[PDB]
Design a protein around this ligand. Structure first.
Ligand SMILES: NC(=O)c1ccc[n+]([C@@H]2O[C@H](COP(=O)([O-])OP(=O)(O)OC[C@H]3O[C@@H](n4cnc5c(N)ncnc54)[C@H](O)[C@@H]3O)[C@@H](O)[C@H]2O)c1
Ligand SMILES: NC(=O)c1ccc[n+]([C@@H]2O[C@H](COP(=O)([O-])OP(=O)(O)OC[C@H]3O[C@@H](n4cnc5c(N)ncnc54)[C@H](O)[C@@H]3O)[C@@H](O)[C@H]2O)c1
Ligand SMILES: [Mg+2]
Ligand SMILES: [Mg+2]
Ligand SMILES: [Mg+2]
Ligand SMILES: [Mg+2]
Ligand SMILES: [Mg+2]
Ligand SMILES: [Mg+2]
Ligand SMILES: [Mg+2]
Ligand SMILES: [Mg+2]
Ligand SMILES: [Mg+2]
Ligand SMILES: [Mg+2]
Ligand SMILES: [Mg+2]
Ligand SMILES: [Mg+2]
Ligand SMILES: [Mg+2]
Lengths: 306, 306
């Protein structure tokens, strides 16, 4: 690799100059790249989204964990390496999800609504509870899922989860394979989605899962919107099949103003910012540095998609 | 002790019939007591606040941790024992405070405000941060303080604290005496107040403390309102001497509708519910069972004030 181009699209997550400056001692020059740039041998590119121009480069680094919007087959045939940013979002997302769960347990969102009205409104006696002793089911036990798990466990929660192998995971009391999803979620106060969007995960959580879930339970989606059937979620909320939801991701983003999801008291909408951090530039830069080292020494790239 | 009277004032915290039912099989009858009840030898009374009528009873158990609204000198003179409920609020308050801090770090309150407007409003890049690596100073290292410390530590925060003895406390890196309060707070992102209201603590946090505090810092008050000079807090928030506050307790409660505190975006107001729990009746009943035994056997009462 002779050059790192920083595609302007990284601006969707972080100021590009902040990222460029973070990489000033990388060992190769780092340059801002506009949307109408050509690439060639020796070029690495960091980007938010895909461009066909990137196929001429040696290596593209996607600055997101999710790569479901990249044409993986087309990279494979063009001989371009593709990496993602999995592994850097566990603290941010884990903290946000702890925040969602504590908001629901302690009723912080309801108090915030009352604050706007200058209203000293006491909760119903049965409403406030502690996370300590409550059960969370974490679906997907990778970086995001483990970040959630570790914080839930530290807060005294009973933690169960779902992963491909069904094999044990640190801080998870019971791990289920994906075919036992209904057993995994049935007794949970919170169900947290942390899987990639795949053929297999699309529409995973729909009306039947909402039926299975406790009426006092809340869904947390920090994965991708289409893991949930969004219309079924609306119907479940309306019907009281579940109590509420904390949603960072949606089938359409920005979430249209006409979505019924905005108006539910016990829904939290966040605008795809559960992983937001003022140091994102540093966190992504560390990945770039790691792979530049691996390229230099001829080892296998970290987070290689194709 | 021949009778446990449950004062109607317990309804300020929990439904009285739920508490009475939780006190079944004490070995003595449990009776509801209205505001004109007379007391006498053999009576224990569980109450939220003080009545002079209680000075004819053997023992009053205050159902709150804080007892600053009880005329302690007068109980001594009358020979009536007084106990409080310290020791049972660490999980509830600890969780609420973790929730406040996560709310600020992850910008959840801003997203909630936007949700009312169906607005997909992105934070400025610098706004979202992680609690991991940030410093919290906890002032008062008792049940509440330690419940805060333990959760802060578990979330990866740097934790310092203030106590009189300056003796070390588990999960606190550095303990300061109160004459070093300004050293303790100077570098903290969050300053949490968890002391009783006493002659010593009244007005502890005022203009000089707000000057000392970082401009990006937030005050959390879960103690009593008058530990803070409220007018100085308002001035500090107006001037930007600190960034914000999470406030559960106030110099006047309910907080008057025309308090300036309601209107600050980076203030969270909660209506003295940081310790709220749907099992409060069980938690207090356990303490009463404990102290009935202590009286029966002639041992020193738990949480004896006078
Ligand atoms: N909201 C955000 O800002 C944000 C940030 C980062 C990631 N994400 C989303 O979260 C996803 C996961 O990110 P990550 O960094 O944890 O990825 P990861 O690869 O570390 O973990 C994903 C885990 O899900 C597992 N998995 C796959 N299919 C599954 C199934 N059917 N059932 C249960 N588990 C399954 C994988 O084996 C893996 O262990 C990303 O693909 C992305 O869509 C969202
Ligand atoms: N917001 C709520 O719902 C809620 C709930 C419970 C308690 N409280 C308030 O919090 C206070 C503390 O409750 P707790 O259960 O932690 O009490 P506690 O007795 O367990 O702890 C109080 C701590 O403050 C320390 N302290 C006393 N005076 C001090 C001083 N001058 N400087 C520094 N430290 C001092 C004590 O030594 C003790 O460690 C109560 O008195 C009450 O006012 C509020
Ligand atoms: Mg309600
Ligand atoms: Mg609990
Ligand atoms: Mg299904
Ligand atoms: Mg259901
Ligand atoms: Mg409901
Ligand atoms: Mg703003
Ligand atoms: Mg941090
Ligand atoms: Mg203790
Ligand atoms: Mg002072
Ligand atoms: Mg200041
Ligand atoms: Mg005050
Ligand atoms: Mg300011
Ligand atoms: Mg207002």
């Amino acid at each position: 690799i002779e050059r790192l181009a920083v595609d302007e699209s990284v601006g969707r997550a972080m100021p590009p100059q902040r990222f460029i400056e973070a990489l000033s001692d990388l060992g190769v020059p780092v340059e801002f790249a506009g949307e109408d740039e050509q690439f060639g041998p020796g070029d690495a590119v960091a980007s938010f989204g895909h461009r066909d121009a990137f196929l001429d480069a040696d290596w593209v680094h996607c600055i997101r964990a999710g790569y479901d919007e990249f044409p993986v087959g087309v990279y494979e045939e063009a001989g371009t390496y593709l990496t993602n940013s999995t592994g850097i979002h566990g603290t941010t997302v884990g903290e946000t999800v702890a925040g969602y769960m504590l908001t629901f347990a302690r009723r912080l969102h309801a108090y915030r609504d009352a604050q706007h009205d200058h209203a000293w409104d006491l909760p119903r006696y049965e409403e406030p509870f502690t996370l300590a002793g409550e059960r969370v089911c974490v679906v997907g036990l990778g970086t995001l899922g483990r970040g959630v798990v570790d914080r839930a466990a530290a807060l005294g929660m009973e933690v169960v989860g779902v992963r491909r192998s069904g094999d044990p995971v640190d801080n998870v009391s019971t791990v289920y394979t994906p075919d036992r999803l209904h057993e995994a979620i049935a007794d949970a106060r919170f169900v947290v989605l942390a899987t990639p969007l795949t053929d297999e995960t699309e529409g995973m959580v729909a009306a039947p899962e909402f039926e299975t879930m406790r009426e006092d339970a809340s869904l947390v989606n920090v994965a991708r919107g289409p893991v949930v059937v969004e219309s079924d979620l609306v119907a479940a909320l309306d019907s009281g099949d579940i109590a509420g939801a904390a949603l960072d991701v949606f089938s359409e983003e920005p979430l249209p103003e006409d979505s019924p999801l905005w108006d539910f008291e016990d829904v939290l909408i966040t605008p795809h910012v559960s992983a937001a951090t003022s140091k994102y530039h540093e966190d992504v830069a560390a990945l770039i540095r790691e792979n530049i080292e691996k390229i230099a020494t001829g080892d296998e790239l970290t987070n290689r998609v194709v």
